[PDB]
């Protein structure tokens, strides 16, 4: 497979290519052409020009119809996108079929609909002469949106940004993770086939520092940079755009906690924490890598989770009953296993997992690790405070509600939290005190696309979703008429 | 000993003081104690702790009531605030009495009221199991808000940030401009007398780089930094908070245009542009330093404006009929005069002004300049493209509507624009094509505090005002209940 | 052709039928089975029951998709719907193709989208015990919506009610005008073929008093009655539902004015008033039957409008260049002609029209009248104060802006007004003073479906459109959780 | 003591008067002049005129400040208002001090605040010529609001309607209950002393039918009628305004249930149903006259409530620990006692009360009744299906969740419901299935004034509160500008 850039209506190669590797077996899947600085310029300039072309003349209704046409395009190639997403990342086929590709479709449809329904405000005011004035606001395209996305939910996160950007009339220069370039490239094909005017959507491949990613953030021609990824990368991009004072929107992961209270449905909570720790092999920014369980049910909770975790099938994306594929790459697995070691050095008890499974086939050339549970670490351990981004959790007992709220909040991060309790007052009382952008009670990662999505502290800045995306991806302009 | 810091409920001095100069005559008004890094730490920690004190326990109704009491406290000492604002800045006593102090009181009242009325959102969704779920959002205090304000509308802009910060339940560490520290110090005494709990509002004095401003900016304990001032300082601040990924809100001035079309009420447009160019001696981020006038009325407009500008009385804040005071400082005076010279060098015709008036009294030791009108420069002239922040405007003819719209938008800034026209279609057609955050038609700087206020490009990031401030100064949290 | 009721998923006849007459030539088009009280009761009960079936279990997104399927079904038979609407009413084919059927399809799509995007409110509050409470609101189906619609824009107005009813999860019993039953019956076929569950949508044919309309109105099983038609009829319906305290929504026509100021674009105003007076042969609740024109342009406006009126082609629905078809029925024509003589008796100058065209072919057996302009009546003339609902307008001069505002507002109706002026202040200053639900400036009947649509005084009560429909066709419930 | 009408800024007598009776002892408190038809017309005409006077030139800020001055004026005479409401109704001094008078003050403050903060909508749209159009909406005063209020919470309910009416710029003609005219007459003095312009607020005394109530209702000069009281009276008023098609808003009582599930905090539920049944001697539209208790806790619950009920002190309004005053009147006690008898006829077990207390003093000439509890009635009994409006409740056991939901909903009414449960899923799952306007979980009659308030079925029409009031008491006008 060859994966090219898509710049100003055309697919183009580059001076340099890099390998896309399948993490299931270590095999080469494709050569990917790295955009250089010149090509990034070309994309941004094309994006700037396209804003003054046909795209800029479309009614909101026409624009929304075309975006639905994009989403029809993905649906018409549904299985091709499933296969591309699975090949890049090793994620289970059922996950790609139920979470990944459908969400990418729903992202475009949801924001296409919002572009049609959304309106703005009218404020009337008195003036000293008695004639009054009126202020009204409009939303306009911000301009060229730079989009930089990660490899953990490639098409979902890539379209989570591209859909609202296009729905708001912007043009886009978008750079997918070098680890998972395939579905974004098929998306370029869908755009092209749907007749999206040239320059409106541009796809550039490559890495971050000293590559397409960095060149994007440094380009004076963009009006905003939306990014999901590692928190320190957020800081770097924020510095990079500072001289342009570009608008920024960041979701930057975290060190999320699950809390299980004594009145929880215990079997429900065990299954739910199994899902929150090990979904996508723990490679969701929302995963619970810290878990607090009331002392009175701690042992029974830990025993039950150990049993469920050792029932997880780890293997081929299409394997019967598969629950976990590999990590995204050998590089990421190096990081995760170095934390597996660190946990033991910090004095953890390894409840289950802690290494890599032996398959006695090509999966041994892949990037698999075992689902892993720890117990016995202090709230200050590095494995309990630093984002690992693997299929792991540490479990600790607690006694008191105010105490556990403090321990959950005692973090430089604050993206998400999951709480288990059957008690009505506790759900609402505790949830509002957790210092994060997203709380789930008796579930996890349940998404209504209209809700504000973002984190606090090192976990991000701004919110996206619903009207928060409609506001971020638009110039909000106030027009005051003296009457 | 004159102007003290206010930290954790105590007025405190510092190791070093600096002079506050009266720009009317260059005399010393007061010594101001410069907060050092330790004192800035102390203020941030105290604000962090106050979030856990009784301030954090107030209901929204009680918090609002207390904010109204701060406003009452300003009103109670109205004329003292006027005298402080006038002493620091030389602004006309009438301006301080009508624009500055009332706006500051209205800032607290409007955001107190919005604190009580504002509400959030309820989203219902279906789920696989048929029982559904609820997402609802809440606003919570962001935490400690760092406020850095400029010297041009001292109390107005300082309260513009402090009022919504308090209304949203935050605590505050605020650093007013070294040039105009008096009214913010009186506001501290007002907070004290009102019984605002210690730590909730903290005042630190000093400069930017290597002083209280830089320190505030780099402190890990703040949750956001809101700033009004020069764009390049905005960029410095954006880099400073980047490692903490702190929320940011910037309004950074610009090079604003006024446009007068042939069908304007000519007398009103001349009066309007006289106000937009010379109010506060041209020291408002919203002033029109570039003016475009349809060729059919260009000479008449220039003639009329010249006559009106030369009627302006430049003098004492309590001078009979006074229109303009001095610039804020000799240092700012030097910048402005550097531009007055550059304008001649760039080939400008000096319709009026272009130097400093000769008063033959103590005003000669202050920082006055003349209101100045230029003509004959090209759209690329430095004097036409760089923010001067003085009482000056260049006037250029135009012929076509699409032409003038392009020349207005050909700028790295985009804060505000004023359009003069009596034509219904043109007003709405042209206003929506101007790439700024704020357009006024047939008026200027007419303010409804509910409206989104901010700029595009180098002129800012984000919006404040109304629900935009309620959002920026709050954590927006989403809570999802599985049923 | 025979037109059946549709009740509980089955097309059914009745003991009695009535004739559907083509107003172009007076010929019989169809027999229509009249629903009796007994069949009305079956529809209401089937609708109640359908709330507890599969319909009531659809997620909002699934309900919206099925509603888009209804719209797809109409589109798939677009030309059949065009032919049906034309046959019943005589409207020009081009109007059916551009206004009527497209708006019916748009009505369903607009409200299906609003069903997906709309959300409700979250209010937090403090309590005595310091634990606080939460109030959240939800939208639920009101229950069974009774829909009674008029003959002037049959499918347009029929679906304007049925679309939001269904979108909000209600079930429906709908009674279209006896003059225009055909497209409603086609809509019933589309609903059936789309798989809309039995009892969700019920179509009952008949008249008002002592027939289907009245019986629907009197049935205790409905939860609301939405109605567009004659004002006195709205009053009757309001009395009929009073004992059940049913929710009601009425749009009741009016005696709308157009105002042409001295600075109007005269040719555009002539064309605009031509359209506002004579569209659909003046059979729109929104038509201008009163026109005020500034004295300085009155003679030229009257002359220009006479020319354009006499250029209108009055003829067959598919005749080349046709502008106007007949009135809906002989009965309506008797009413209109009655007013035409009354105008003469009241002292009117007949500028043009005032009678019936003579075709010397089968159209003479139809229900045609001529477009008619009057001049010289006083503001108290009956022909200036009572809604005629034919292709007529009276034109009167004025001198003063406040004067004409008073004359427009001096009416027992207040549905719409159209104003013509090129002046920015005038447009906003005048529009806000007109006591109507809807003002247009320099256009007429330009519809954005998100806007509140409705009248004041005798012209209606309640608003529909956008969120106004979502609120009216829903129970709004507040749920207060003590924490 | 005399109570006059207040019309066009003047207190005026009438050709007739009637007795205001203290229900504690049947002693005459004052004579009340009964406005006649001529006087009502004079009030409506004065309110109509005042719309064009100084009231109507008020900015929204200035109008709100005057409204707050009205509130201040009530606070300034707080104890007098307390005394007037007690005298009229016999309510405990304590309830008047904490519930009635402060809520009346909060009603004006909350709507004055809303008046300042509320804004409207801007919708942009494409047009066929490519220039587009703008639709913006505005709120204007509806006109003259007719207000008719009941005697159970005289000032609270009088001001609940009057406050938003005035906050929206309307003028008011208000008719308080014949049983409780005092606090409203004091309000008129406050309005007057506050400088409220003549004609803005008019107070007319009298009864319903054939008196000031009915006359208001039939007057063609009002624009709306807002009413809280008996459901049949709402049906009467709806017919009365129907010929003018006036806007109507009704809150019409009900037969509200409380539901106590087995996992309720039993003690809390016992206390909560005590309050919900006997507050204001059960004369609240919101009281729980039907209570369902899970079978497993039924006997315990009844036992507990009997004991708490017999603890209640029934006596003088100022009497030591008084919990209950008398009924409002003798006529009303007759109605209630008649239900006490019917309960027995219908076969009910009297757990407690069921008659009148015996004082051996002036109170024996009052209108006291005992707090009563019944058991053993069927769901169809008249005592369990008809509004008594006394301090009575019937308690019935239930077994299943879906069962009790069906029984709660099996009512021609639907105002409020209180649910008791500690379970998170149940509380949300059950609350949304109750067919009422208002649900409380684990509390009762907890009021956030921003929330929508109203009932379904016979219990009302429309919603009031927050923006629902701002919309009902305003004309919503849409203004569409073609560009
Ligand atoms: N947007 C406005 O309203 C506004 C206001 C004042 C000045 N200006 C512009 O800025 C120019 C210079 O004036 P100025 O020097 O007072 O503006 P400045 O932006 O440098 O300083 C304004 C505020 O920022 C603080 N500050 C400065 N440097 C900082 C730093 N490195 N870190 C943290 N805080 C810092 C200052 O102490 C002051 O409170 C003017 O000529 C004008 O062009 C704009
Ligand atoms: N607002 C509008 O758009 C509109 C539309 C049509 C007619 N009108 C006015 O009404 C006049 C007469 O026309 P029309 O008789 O067809 O209008 P109408 O108001 O009497 O009837 C319209 C609809 O209401 C039904 N209806 C009539 N009486 C009823 C009753 N007592 N109970 C229940 N339903 C009833 C009809 O069957 C039809 O479906 C026209 O001349 C015109 O002035 C207004
Ligand atoms: C009345 O004759 C016209 C009604 C039109 C509407 O209701 C509409 O939505 O356009
Ligand atoms: C009915 O008896 C009580 C009504 C209460 C209100 O309307 C309220 O605002 O609290
Ligand atoms: Na890969
Ligand atoms: Na100074
Ligand atoms: Na017909
Ligand atoms: Na009484």
Numbering used by the authors:
A (entry chain A), B (entry chain B), C (entry chain D), D (entry chain C): 18 to 500
Cite, word for word, the article reporting this structure.
One enzyme in particular, 2-aminomuconate-6-semialdehyde dehydrogenase (AMSDH), is responsible for oxidizing the unstable metabolic intermediate 2-aminomuconate-6-semialdehyde (2-AMS) to 2-aminomuconate (2-AM). On the basis of sequence alignment, AMSDH is a member of the hydroxymuconic-semialdehyde dehydrogenase (HMSDH) family under the aldehyde dehydrogenase (ALDH) superfamily. The complete AMSDH model includes four polypeptides per asymmetric unit describing one homotetramer. Each monomer of AMSDH contains three domains: a subunit interaction domain, a catalytic domain and an NAD+ binding domain.
